[PDB]
């Protein structure tokens, strides 16, 4: 029985365990995308590194929530990480879709904290996660728009390049 | 149609556009006050610079909210900046009155975020704006009190001096 | 009644107050242009920063004229800053059009100084404003011409990336 | 007969020699003011140094005009430097009055250059003299206004101490 735990509903503990699983699954899709654009036939190394670094940071998010689960006196429960599936534009639109899905799950986590009168968890989600999440979505939204604008071929390669020196 | 926008009510988008207008209008009053105490006949250069620097920072606040409007996938709408109108004490009491008006508008913006279940905007307003706003009000309240205490003439000039080397 | 005022006609004082209003209004349009290209869907961050910094420097022009109004012993009068309205080519042509109307207003101010036998104000406008104005117009004219040359899509994005690191 | 002289009217040469005389005379009054506030009984050393350095810079203005007379191929003609005459407020108002008569003489010199189609001399007066003159008048006007505000006694002494470390 936890020594630290206080004002920490089992709903909140459970929502954090679910969000941990979301971050792992998104980290896995980003590793898939890295694995794709790193192909010899694709050779978009800018997108490969951006997706590779995006995968480290989703896993760092999972670590932060494990660390937060234990700070609060909850217990971490791990679930299966499901396998994931112009290509550049499609991948960015996929990445945008995933950040918004992560955002949507984080808002639900926030709602669980609101409804359980857990204000430190609510401020944790809104300070350490919700603020980066909207910055990430806008950044990826701009990537989507820039890939639409450069068009296929030379412009995609140029935008990849670019990512690689950034 | 916005790629980024998510859980961002048109009320919230509209409140940010209104707050942008409040910051511009307050920035304009501070430039008026700077323009006044910079007069040859007034020569209160400490208050002129303090009001001049206060004008840059209100405009920086407007920029932050434009930047935030676009981060959230909203669209910036700009409205007219209306013309503004012991002198030292009166100007500080005017400045205090304006910080409290800005504060009151920011709380309404916060309420719009509360009512629309937009927690990142609420934490943005309370973290990036509401905390400086109460620090600014207290600082200006102390200026008001110090100008009351020094009295007219020599004490006003001394307090201006003071501001100038601060 | 001003202690400093000497050979400073009410026409000149009035012309400076109008040019103050012009610089604020141009500063406001540049902030509008900043707010537009900073959109998630537009994502031309090079133009957003160029318009944002152009906005900063028009406001600094307004401050210099306030500072000059008070140096000359005149009195600053502030008027309302009215709200402003390929997108990249169109915005640069709008910006070229604003620099030229700013220039045209500056020459009228210069004429007012010529007619009121105010050689210091005439040399101020010539030295501190008319020389930058003519350099700014050429720079923006060059940007117009480069955006026509690069064409839509990939070339616009490339030119924008140039601005962003320039 | 001058090797350099070109488009340099005898009116312009004569106007420079008169302005040389004006700067020497203003330099002399400032040395008088220095000599007064340096008295043991007056002991306002901040005003004494400010008037002493003001005297140095009026003499440097005379040297620049000699240097300019010779640059233009004219011939310097020197005339007698006539002897000069709350004390602090009164002396600053006297100093404001001298900067403005110096300004008025400079504009007449500028007019002489305008009428003799001497644009280099006109731009010299505008650029090297009329711009500092207008800044000096404002500065001294501000000192007048601050000495009115601080009042007699302790405030005058305080303002003087400010000058001494400024
Ligand atoms: Mg994440
Ligand atoms: Mg992310
Ligand atoms: Mg503000
Ligand atoms: Mg403030
Ligand atoms: Mg007239
Ligand atoms: Mg300008
Ligand atoms: Mg000139
Ligand atoms: Mg410009
Ligand atoms: Mg003649
Ligand atoms: Mg002089
Ligand atoms: Mg002088």
XYZ file of C-alpha atoms and ligand atoms in Angstrom:
675
model
C 0.000 0.000 0.000
C 1.388 3.361 -1.153
C 3.102 5.664 1.347
C 2.859 8.726 -0.890
C -0.647 8.423 -2.320
C -3.033 11.236 -1.451
C -6.055 12.719 -3.272
C -5.245 10.394 -6.151
C -8.332 8.622 -7.490
C -8.057 5.237 -9.131
C -9.645 6.885 -12.184
C -6.674 9.274 -12.366
C -4.190 6.454 -11.831
C -5.947 4.537 -14.608
C -6.033 7.500 -17.018
C -2.277 7.959 -16.584
C -1.716 4.268 -17.336
C -3.834 4.697 -20.480
C -1.942 7.822 -21.520
C 1.349 5.989 -20.970
C 0.071 3.428 -23.477
C -0.917 6.148 -25.963
C 2.561 7.698 -25.855
C 4.224 4.307 -26.392
C 1.937 3.582 -29.352
C 2.593 6.976 -30.925
C 6.308 6.481 -30.284
C 6.001 3.193 -32.182
C 4.283 4.767 -35.211
C 7.058 7.387 -35.380
C 9.649 4.600 -35.390
C 7.716 2.958 -38.233
C 7.799 6.237 -40.168
C 11.514 6.577 -39.490
C 11.993 2.995 -40.697
C 10.152 3.902 -43.924
C 11.835 7.148 -45.022
C 15.227 5.613 -44.122
C 14.724 3.100 -46.958
C 17.301 3.112 -49.752
C 14.436 3.568 -52.267
C 12.954 6.518 -50.364
C 16.083 8.287 -49.077
C 14.217 11.154 -47.355
C 16.699 11.323 -44.513
C 15.310 14.629 -43.235
C 11.944 13.025 -42.550
C 13.672 9.888 -41.249
C 15.552 11.853 -38.577
C 12.578 14.065 -37.721
C 10.413 10.984 -37.225
C 13.269 9.267 -35.348
C 13.691 12.213 -32.975
C 9.913 12.447 -32.636
C 9.966 8.802 -31.498
C 12.512 9.444 -28.742
C 10.401 12.326 -27.436
C 7.148 10.325 -27.344
C 9.017 7.694 -25.333
C 10.362 10.433 -23.063
C 6.730 11.481 -22.544
C 5.897 7.928 -21.466
C 8.818 7.982 -19.004
C 7.593 11.314 -17.572
C 4.164 9.778 -16.922
C 5.643 6.663 -15.350
C 7.697 8.999 -13.172
C 4.518 10.952 -12.385
C 2.446 7.836 -11.660
C 5.017 6.789 -9.045
C 5.358 10.316 -7.629
C 1.605 10.242 -6.961
C 1.737 6.815 -5.311
C -0.042 5.039 -8.160
C 1.111 1.814 -9.772
C 2.172 1.552 -13.412
C 0.298 -0.983 -15.554
C 1.621 -1.636 -19.050
C -0.489 -2.787 -21.985
C 0.488 -4.091 -25.446
C 2.004 -1.646 -27.908
C 0.108 -2.361 -31.118
C 1.973 -2.665 -34.385
C 1.527 0.287 -36.779
C 1.147 0.029 -40.568
C 2.890 11.674 -51.962
C 4.432 9.690 -49.124
C 5.989 12.709 -47.445
C 2.691 14.617 -47.298
C 0.769 11.504 -46.277
C 3.207 10.784 -43.443
C 2.983 14.353 -42.122
C -0.798 14.191 -42.248
C -0.544 10.914 -40.388
C 1.766 12.549 -37.826
C -0.622 15.497 -37.446
C -3.489 13.057 -36.953
C -1.500 11.291 -34.219
C -0.605 14.467 -32.322
C -4.290 15.446 -32.315
C -5.229 11.958 -31.109
C -2.658 12.284 -28.317
C -4.074 15.735 -27.586
C -7.623 14.341 -27.437
C -6.538 11.625 -25.011
C -4.673 14.169 -22.883
C -7.801 16.330 -22.638
C -9.740 13.284 -21.449
C -6.990 12.688 -18.879
C -7.422 16.328 -17.875
C -11.186 15.851 -17.566
C -10.636 12.866 -15.282
C -8.457 15.075 -13.096
C -11.081 17.860 -13.110
C -13.898 15.488 -12.205
C -11.846 13.915 -9.421
C -10.786 17.259 -7.918
C -7.138 16.446 -8.526
C -5.720 19.902 -9.319
C -2.024 19.024 -9.340
C -2.584 16.347 -11.963
C -4.705 18.781 -13.969
C -1.953 21.405 -13.814
C 0.640 18.745 -14.611
C -1.248 17.716 -17.760
C -1.912 21.329 -18.775
C 1.629 22.567 -17.931
C 3.929 19.689 -18.912
C 1.867 18.180 -21.761
C -0.999 20.296 -23.126
C 1.288 23.257 -23.850
C 3.877 21.271 -25.852
C 1.060 19.355 -27.517
C -0.483 22.464 -29.118
C 2.983 23.693 -30.112
C 3.750 20.309 -31.735
C 0.439 20.225 -33.619
C 0.991 23.704 -35.056
C 4.520 22.793 -36.040
C 3.316 19.655 -37.821
C 0.404 21.534 -39.350
C 2.940 23.967 -40.836
C 4.946 21.027 -42.214
C 1.777 19.714 -43.857
C 1.100 23.124 -45.414
C 4.700 23.521 -46.618
C 4.642 20.054 -48.214
C 1.389 20.960 -49.975
C 2.989 24.154 -51.270
C 6.327 22.739 -52.521
C 4.541 20.012 -54.502
C 5.909 16.634 -55.448
C 9.458 15.832 -56.490
C 12.091 18.520 -56.193
C 10.128 20.507 -53.610
C 9.620 17.516 -51.309
C 13.339 16.699 -51.520
C 14.135 20.361 -50.809
C 11.834 20.452 -47.766
C 13.358 17.207 -46.536
C 16.767 18.859 -46.626
C 15.942 21.552 -44.593
C 14.434 19.229 -42.009
C 17.785 17.479 -42.057
C 19.688 20.714 -41.281
C 17.245 21.810 -38.559
C -9.915 25.559 -42.942
C -7.385 25.187 -40.111
C -5.118 22.131 -39.984
C -4.160 22.653 -36.343
C -7.469 23.629 -34.754
C -8.774 21.279 -32.082
C -10.988 21.832 -29.010
C -10.880 25.533 -29.810
C -14.311 27.158 -29.601
C -15.140 30.197 -31.676
C -15.886 31.928 -28.359
C -12.266 31.341 -27.304
C -10.949 32.471 -30.681
C -13.107 35.586 -30.347
C -12.027 36.325 -26.758
C -8.375 36.182 -27.831
C -9.090 38.615 -30.671
C -10.752 40.925 -28.131
C -7.839 40.623 -25.712
C -5.424 41.381 -28.557
C -7.372 44.614 -29.036
C -7.217 45.423 -25.310
C -3.429 45.029 -25.246
C -3.020 47.267 -28.308
C -5.251 49.929 -26.741
C -3.372 49.822 -23.442
C -0.101 49.933 -25.377
C -1.426 53.083 -27.059
C -2.322 54.811 -23.770
C 1.195 54.083 -22.469
C 2.654 55.689 -25.595
C 0.429 58.714 -24.948
C 1.751 58.910 -21.382
C 5.310 58.602 -22.654
C 4.581 61.376 -25.162
C 3.349 63.572 -22.284
C 6.111 63.239 -19.670
C 8.705 63.564 -22.470
C 7.516 67.156 -23.010
C 10.087 69.916 -22.527
C 7.700 71.571 -20.016
C 7.233 68.358 -18.021
C 10.706 66.785 -18.221
C 9.860 63.723 -16.081
C 12.086 61.446 -18.112
C 11.864 58.629 -15.561
C 8.119 58.364 -16.083
C 8.576 58.878 -19.830
C 10.872 55.847 -20.114
C 8.809 53.716 -17.733
C 5.685 54.444 -19.767
C 7.660 53.931 -23.002
C 8.948 50.535 -21.862
C 5.474 49.676 -20.584
C 4.196 50.367 -24.116
C 6.651 47.954 -25.740
C 5.604 45.221 -23.310
C 1.859 45.675 -23.911
C 2.585 45.347 -27.629
C 4.671 42.248 -26.916
C 1.606 40.872 -25.106
C -0.467 41.467 -28.242
C 2.153 39.629 -30.330
C 2.084 36.684 -27.885
C -1.696 36.411 -28.314
C -1.478 36.646 -32.090
C 1.137 33.899 -31.895
C -1.205 31.924 -29.624
C -4.266 32.478 -31.826
C -2.366 30.973 -34.770
C -0.899 28.139 -32.676
C -4.474 27.137 -31.813
C -5.631 27.286 -35.435
C -7.757 30.397 -34.946
C -7.710 33.441 -37.195
C -6.608 36.889 -36.033
C -9.125 39.717 -36.467
C -7.923 43.250 -35.780
C -10.137 46.107 -34.630
C -9.485 49.868 -34.376
C -7.083 51.084 -31.713
C -8.930 54.007 -30.149
C -7.110 57.243 -29.464
C -6.372 57.929 -25.773
C -6.610 61.331 -24.061
C -0.311 66.173 -9.730
C 0.288 64.780 -13.205
C 2.702 62.097 -12.051
C 0.269 60.691 -9.474
C -2.667 61.002 -11.864
C -0.790 59.137 -14.601
C 0.167 56.299 -12.241
C -3.422 56.031 -11.064
C -4.423 55.942 -14.705
C -1.834 53.212 -15.348
C -3.066 51.229 -12.333
C -6.624 51.580 -13.611
C -5.525 50.232 -17.006
C -3.689 47.205 -15.610
C -6.798 46.305 -13.596
C -8.955 46.744 -16.704
C -6.588 44.448 -18.611
C -6.755 42.042 -15.675
C -10.570 42.129 -15.710
C -10.630 41.382 -19.435
C -8.118 38.561 -18.984
C -10.309 36.972 -16.303
C -13.246 37.102 -18.713
C -11.020 35.448 -21.326
C -10.215 32.833 -18.688
C -13.922 32.330 -17.981
C -14.568 31.768 -21.682
C -11.881 29.088 -21.636
C -13.370 27.499 -18.489
C -16.880 27.461 -19.923
C -15.658 25.988 -23.205
C -13.586 23.249 -21.540
C -10.421 24.597 -23.120
C -7.850 23.867 -20.391
C -4.693 24.734 -22.319
C -6.003 28.209 -23.075
C -7.034 28.593 -19.437
C -3.555 27.574 -18.278
C -2.007 29.815 -20.928
C -3.960 32.831 -19.650
C -3.271 31.974 -16.001
C 0.427 31.085 -16.561
C 1.635 33.552 -19.205
C -0.664 36.506 -18.404
C -2.537 36.384 -15.083
C 0.672 35.926 -13.079
C 2.516 38.914 -14.605
C -0.696 40.924 -14.449
C -0.973 40.710 -10.642
C 2.753 41.431 -10.314
C 2.385 44.512 -12.559
C -0.641 45.810 -10.640
C 1.162 45.532 -7.302
C 4.204 47.241 -8.744
C 2.085 50.111 -10.063
C 0.095 50.237 -6.843
C 3.395 50.723 -4.990
C 4.328 53.533 -7.399
C 0.995 55.202 -6.644
C 1.630 54.914 -2.900
C 5.204 56.221 -3.194
C 4.033 59.217 -5.248
C 1.399 59.957 -2.598
C 4.077 59.810 0.093
C 6.779 61.964 -1.570
C 4.269 64.751 -2.267
C 4.428 67.307 -5.027
C 7.529 69.018 -6.360
C 10.912 67.832 -5.177
C 9.622 64.408 -4.132
C 7.982 63.707 -7.496
C 11.192 64.716 -9.292
C 13.170 62.495 -6.903
C 10.881 59.503 -7.511
C 11.113 60.105 -11.247
C 14.883 59.829 -10.982
C 14.934 56.699 -9.476
C 12.574 55.321 -12.099
C 15.107 56.574 -14.611
C 17.968 54.626 -12.968
C 15.913 51.434 -12.556
C 3.364 76.884 -23.214
C 6.541 75.238 -24.509
C 9.941 76.356 -23.241
C 11.768 74.886 -26.222
C 9.541 75.838 -29.141
C 11.290 78.032 -31.689
C 10.607 78.500 -35.422
C 8.227 75.559 -35.199
C 5.013 76.285 -37.076
C 1.671 74.789 -36.111
C 1.677 73.310 -39.638
C 4.888 71.401 -38.877
C 3.627 70.256 -35.481
C 0.406 69.110 -37.145
C 2.240 67.380 -40.008
C 4.380 65.397 -37.547
C 1.264 64.282 -35.669
C -0.226 63.057 -38.952
C 2.958 61.226 -39.894
C 2.949 59.628 -36.442
C -0.520 58.327 -37.329
C 0.715 57.033 -40.697
C 3.595 55.069 -39.140
C 1.262 53.498 -36.557
C -1.159 52.471 -39.309
C 1.583 50.955 -41.463
C 2.907 49.222 -38.350
C -0.581 47.792 -37.858
C -0.881 46.475 -41.422
C 2.508 44.778 -41.026
C 1.241 43.104 -37.861
C -1.795 41.961 -39.840
C 0.539 40.499 -42.478
C 2.559 38.855 -39.709
C -0.619 37.362 -38.247
C -1.631 35.959 -41.658
C 1.561 34.174 -42.772
C 1.969 32.850 -39.220
C -1.200 30.791 -39.795
C -0.893 27.015 -39.572
C -2.403 26.704 -43.101
C -0.077 29.327 -44.602
C 3.131 28.514 -42.715
C 5.399 30.994 -44.547
C 7.401 31.792 -41.446
C 10.044 33.787 -43.321
C 7.410 36.291 -44.443
C 5.787 36.231 -40.999
C 9.059 37.256 -39.333
C 9.866 39.809 -42.016
C 6.448 41.396 -41.564
C 6.705 41.152 -37.759
C 10.071 42.948 -37.719
C 8.797 45.435 -40.295
C 5.986 46.133 -37.817
C 8.485 46.711 -35.013
C 10.431 49.236 -37.084
C 7.375 51.234 -38.173
C 6.465 51.575 -34.494
C 10.014 52.709 -33.815
C 9.528 55.338 -36.538
C 6.443 56.567 -34.675
C 8.451 56.774 -31.420
C 11.206 58.799 -33.140
C 8.613 61.297 -34.372
C 7.047 61.568 -30.923
C 10.556 62.092 -29.601
C 11.079 64.701 -32.324
C 7.742 66.436 -31.687
C 8.735 66.880 -28.043
C 12.292 67.923 -28.944
C 10.811 70.747 -31.041
C 8.449 71.805 -28.245
C 5.293 70.652 -30.032
C 2.503 68.567 -28.529
C 1.717 65.005 -29.572
C -1.850 64.315 -30.708
C -2.861 60.706 -31.318
C -5.599 59.584 -33.677
C -7.232 56.159 -34.134
C -5.177 53.382 -35.699
C -7.663 52.028 -38.212
C -7.961 48.294 -38.591
C -6.263 46.772 -41.664
C -7.797 44.230 -44.079
C -0.371 34.158 -54.846
C -0.687 35.493 -51.314
C 3.058 36.000 -51.020
C 3.362 38.149 -54.155
C 0.192 39.990 -53.217
C 1.371 40.818 -49.681
C 4.744 42.050 -50.894
C 3.000 44.286 -53.423
C 0.780 45.517 -50.624
C 3.911 46.197 -48.552
C 5.521 48.013 -51.492
C 2.340 50.056 -51.798
C 2.480 50.995 -48.097
C 6.132 52.063 -48.187
C 5.343 54.332 -51.145
C 2.332 55.944 -49.483
C 4.481 56.388 -46.373
C 7.080 58.002 -48.628
C 4.425 60.229 -50.229
C 3.249 61.378 -46.791
C 6.853 62.006 -45.748
C 7.406 64.251 -48.772
C 4.295 66.243 -47.904
C 5.682 66.639 -44.384
C 8.936 67.749 -45.992
C 7.024 70.246 -48.138
C 5.324 71.628 -45.030
C 8.762 72.176 -43.506
C 10.034 73.822 -46.731
C 7.091 76.208 -46.830
C 7.304 77.086 -43.140
C 11.064 77.794 -43.453
C 11.844 74.951 -41.036
C 15.204 73.665 -42.301
C 15.944 71.501 -39.277
C 12.722 69.539 -39.702
C 13.314 69.361 -43.452
C 16.793 67.929 -42.852
C 15.412 65.567 -40.202
C 12.881 64.108 -42.669
C 15.535 63.960 -45.435
C 18.207 62.444 -43.185
C 16.405 60.192 -40.708
C 13.418 59.135 -42.829
C 13.591 59.859 -46.565
C 16.906 58.021 -46.946
C 15.717 54.782 -45.261
C 12.343 55.049 -46.984
C 13.922 54.972 -50.444
C 16.189 52.062 -49.446
C 13.211 50.151 -47.988
C 11.162 50.632 -51.158
C 13.968 49.270 -53.339
C 14.424 46.284 -51.043
C 10.705 45.521 -51.166
C 10.547 46.142 -54.905
C 13.360 43.569 -55.224
C 11.316 41.090 -53.161
C 8.315 41.692 -55.438
C 10.482 40.968 -58.480
C 12.015 37.813 -56.942
C 8.564 36.441 -56.056
C 7.424 36.998 -59.641
C 10.504 35.169 -60.904
C 10.345 32.106 -58.611
C 6.668 31.492 -59.422
C 4.042 29.838 -57.268
C 4.610 26.832 -55.034
C 8.142 25.591 -54.539
C 9.735 28.911 -55.482
C 7.628 30.926 -53.031
C 8.530 28.483 -50.252
C 12.214 28.711 -51.222
C 12.169 32.530 -51.200
C 10.442 32.442 -47.799
C 13.163 30.152 -46.410
C 15.722 32.673 -47.671
C 13.988 35.457 -45.738
C 13.843 33.304 -42.643
C 17.674 32.980 -42.572
C 18.306 36.571 -43.751
C 43.231 84.799 -53.603
C 41.820 81.442 -52.500
C 42.641 78.281 -54.437
C 39.669 76.394 -53.024
C 36.890 78.972 -53.140
C 33.976 77.917 -55.322
C 30.295 78.944 -55.185
C 31.043 80.616 -51.868
C 29.411 84.034 -51.686
C 30.835 86.902 -49.664
C 27.494 86.825 -47.802
C 28.144 83.234 -46.700
C 31.743 83.979 -45.739
C 30.516 86.988 -43.763
C 27.687 85.030 -42.115
C 30.129 82.348 -40.924
C 32.396 85.013 -39.429
C 29.411 86.431 -37.537
C 28.369 83.002 -36.298
C 31.953 82.426 -35.162
C 31.534 85.588 -33.078
C 28.217 84.343 -31.669
C 29.691 81.008 -30.540
C 32.629 82.762 -28.848
C 30.239 85.092 -27.020
C 28.005 82.247 -25.851
C 31.141 80.367 -24.816
C 32.103 83.425 -22.770
C 28.739 83.683 -20.999
C 28.987 79.989 -20.095
C 32.413 80.644 -18.591
C 30.857 83.494 -16.619
C 28.177 81.092 -15.359
C 30.899 78.577 -14.512
C 32.798 81.250 -12.585
C 29.661 82.174 -10.603
C 28.443 78.759 -9.391
C 32.058 77.829 -8.617
C 31.999 80.514 -5.897
C 32.580 79.389 -2.320
C 29.260 81.041 -1.282
C 27.285 79.443 -4.126
C 28.936 76.011 -4.223
C 26.653 74.462 -6.875
C 29.453 72.466 -8.436
C 27.143 70.450 -10.689
C 26.020 73.632 -12.445
C 29.589 74.959 -12.470
C 30.826 71.876 -14.338
C 27.830 71.825 -16.660
C 28.434 75.463 -17.554
C 32.203 74.894 -17.829
C 31.741 71.998 -20.269
C 29.054 73.953 -22.112
C 31.699 76.668 -22.512
C 34.182 74.161 -23.925
C 31.687 72.952 -26.526
C 30.689 76.434 -27.708
C 34.382 77.136 -28.297
C 34.605 73.875 -30.209
C 31.683 75.103 -32.334
C 33.691 78.241 -33.119
C 36.703 76.102 -34.125
C 34.533 73.974 -36.450
C 33.298 77.121 -38.194
C 36.832 78.464 -38.553
C 37.758 75.065 -39.942
C 34.743 75.306 -42.254
C 35.508 78.885 -43.331
C 38.977 77.758 -44.406
C 37.644 74.579 -46.041
C 35.415 76.775 -48.226
C 38.295 79.108 -49.106
C 36.941 82.060 -47.123
C 38.907 84.225 -44.707
C 38.315 84.300 -40.960
C 37.597 87.706 -39.420
C 37.461 87.959 -35.635
C 35.498 90.551 -33.697
C 35.552 91.439 -29.981
C 34.096 88.950 -27.516
C 31.980 91.257 -25.388
C 32.018 90.773 -21.654
C 28.974 89.007 -20.153
C 26.989 90.125 -17.078
C 16.670 81.483 -7.521
C 20.059 81.830 -9.179
C 19.947 78.270 -10.475
C 16.592 78.654 -12.246
C 17.628 82.072 -13.498
C 20.933 80.854 -14.970
C 19.288 77.916 -16.713
C 16.717 80.273 -18.221
C 19.569 82.503 -19.299
C 21.258 79.454 -20.852
C 18.008 78.481 -22.591
C 17.792 82.040 -23.886
C 21.347 81.845 -25.273
C 20.804 78.524 -27.049
C 17.715 79.986 -28.735
C 19.477 83.149 -29.882
C 22.309 80.933 -31.130
C 19.666 78.906 -32.959
C 18.100 82.082 -34.384
C 21.495 83.234 -35.673
C 22.125 79.785 -37.149
C 18.847 79.939 -39.077
C 19.794 83.337 -40.478
C 23.108 81.824 -41.573
C 21.096 79.005 -43.124
C 18.893 81.554 -44.899
C 21.987 83.289 -46.266
C 23.117 79.950 -47.689
C 19.634 79.290 -49.159
C 19.565 82.676 -50.860
C 23.109 82.399 -52.202
C 22.373 78.909 -53.624
C 24.987 77.370 -51.315
C 23.551 73.910 -50.602
C 26.699 72.512 -49.018
C 26.784 75.260 -46.400
C 23.033 74.908 -45.896
C 23.449 71.169 -45.291
C 26.446 71.823 -43.034
C 24.391 74.148 -40.799
C 21.419 71.724 -40.867
C 23.552 68.638 -40.214
C 26.407 69.737 -37.956
C 24.696 72.569 -36.061
C 20.905 72.817 -36.348
C 20.407 69.220 -35.198
C 22.521 69.565 -32.011
C 21.105 73.030 -31.369
C 17.538 71.717 -31.201
C 18.614 68.814 -28.960
C 20.535 71.204 -26.669
C 17.538 73.524 -26.333
C 15.256 70.651 -25.324
C 17.794 69.406 -22.794
C 18.101 72.874 -21.274
C 14.350 73.422 -21.394
C 14.035 70.152 -19.434
C 16.525 71.467 -16.856
C 14.490 74.679 -16.550
C 11.349 72.626 -15.924
C 13.054 70.348 -13.360
C 14.397 73.352 -11.426
C 10.896 74.834 -11.300
C 9.546 71.529 -10.003
C 12.147 70.866 -7.273
C 11.753 74.373 -5.824
C 14.304 76.426 -3.938
C 16.772 75.071 -1.405
C 17.059 71.329 -0.985
C 15.633 70.556 -4.422
C 18.049 72.870 -6.243
C 20.969 71.272 -4.391
C 19.639 67.800 -5.251
C 19.271 68.662 -8.953
C 22.809 70.088 -8.925
C 24.166 66.847 -7.426
C 22.417 64.985 -10.248
C 24.206 67.136 -12.829
C 27.507 66.599 -11.082
C 27.251 62.792 -11.562
C 25.654 63.029 -15.037
Mg 3.333 12.781 -26.591
Mg 4.651 15.512 -29.919
Mg -0.901 43.420 -21.004
Mg 1.463 45.241 -17.632
Mg 0.116 77.387 -42.427
Mg 8.225 54.236 -41.691
Mg 20.127 68.188 -45.863
Mg 9.748 50.925 -43.913
Mg 24.459 89.416 -51.106
Mg 26.816 76.497 -30.374
Mg 24.814 74.458 -27.202
